[PDB]
Symmetry: none
Subunit: 215 residues, 2 copies
């Protein structure tokens, strides 16, 4: 069979609805009067009525806005029948990929994280790991996160005693001079931002990490 | 066989080129490496190079702006061949319609039209008929004319002694007091305007109508 290629379709479709996707037809038109129809999950199986087809023209249409997070792919099959109901073509697979859109922001597993670190710890010492998640596709830019520290109270002896690992969320000491008798609890605001942490196009969320220095 | 439907295309395309039309493929690409091509007047036969297809991806494209008044329809055929060169599908017929654009203004059959009317004639008299053509599609708005008079000479006894049949181009008298000893010859300027005469968008052209009154 000469098949039609996969239909890639951005989620949160703008409208107006029902928007057309593709017109299909069987070259048997010229002989006899036909009737088109589509079957499978999306059409005549739950969730029904999302994809519809014109019995006459073969114009396949989508009715509602899609959501990759709910259904990321639809496998449909189109058919062709004559006036007294007989199959005139081998049902064609129509694959519909719901393309991902950056429609939900990062989310830390907790609002406050807690960590510890012994005083006078050599630069390079590991303290704790914050992690966040994103309901977008991890393979798409929409789902790829990057962490950064925004603030650091108090700001002594250095205004950045710590560094966050860009990708992994692991926090490390860069500075020396951790002295409990001077600063007991550093408090960081970490920001996880998506799309490789693109400032303009990236969504963000923040959390807090409280690093107690111990004796 | 399931086939792709006709492709519609406005003439006088803007670009940039090559602008793509439709991606086709054969479901044999899963088994073996394929190679697509196109044939016919428009592809490999004269005029050559207007339409092309990507050997690997099957993306069909247009290279140049089209012109309905030169070629209004293209009959192509797509092929799919295996590595060694054998056909792997029945060539698919591809129909391409060049949709009309209003790209040329109306044209009168004569610059100067002559006509007659007996003196003192009744209001309602046919005197002559003027007709203009249009190289655009008669059935589209781009080729549907509306005639009308722009000015008269002289403007006595009335400033508008005549009127034009809005659609047909039959000129009809709307005033009496025609007299060879007062005004021997009138001379009108008629204006054919396309697109149901739409003053804003429609293109126009003018011609003359010389109406002699007789004893
Ligand atoms: Ca969504
Ligand atoms: Ca996101
Ligand atoms: Ca998404
Ligand atoms: Ca043209
Ligand atoms: Ca035209
Ligand atoms: Ca025209």
């Amino acid at each position: 069979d000469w098949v039609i290629p996969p239909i890639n379709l951005p989620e949160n479709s703008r409208g107006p609805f029902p928007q057309e996707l593709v017109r299909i037809r069987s070259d048997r038109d010229k002989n006899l009067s036909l009737r088109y129809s589509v079957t499978g999950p999306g059409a005549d199986q739950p969730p029904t009525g999302i994809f519809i087809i014109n019995p006459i023209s073969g114009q396949l249409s989508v009715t509602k806005p899609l959501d990759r997070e709910l259904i990321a792919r639809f496998h449909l099959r189109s058919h062709a029948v004559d006036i007294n109901g007989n199959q005139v073509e081998n049902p064609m697979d129509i694959v519909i990929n719901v393309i991902d859109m950056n429609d939900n922001r990062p989310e830390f597993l907790h609002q406050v994280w807690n960590g510890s670190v012994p005083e006078g710890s050599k630069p390079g010492t590991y303290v704790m790991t914050v992690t966040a998640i994103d309901a977008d596709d991890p393979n798409a830019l929409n789902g790829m996160l990057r962490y950064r520290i925004l603030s650091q109270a108090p700001s002594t002896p250095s205004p950045n005693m710590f560094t966050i690992n860009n990708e992994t969320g692991d926090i490390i000491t860069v500075a020396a001079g951790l002295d409990r008798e001077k600063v007991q609890q550093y408090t960081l605001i970490i920001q996880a931002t998506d799309m490789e942490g693109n400032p303009t196009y990236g969504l963000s969320n923040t959390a807090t990490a409280v690093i107690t220095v111990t004796d």
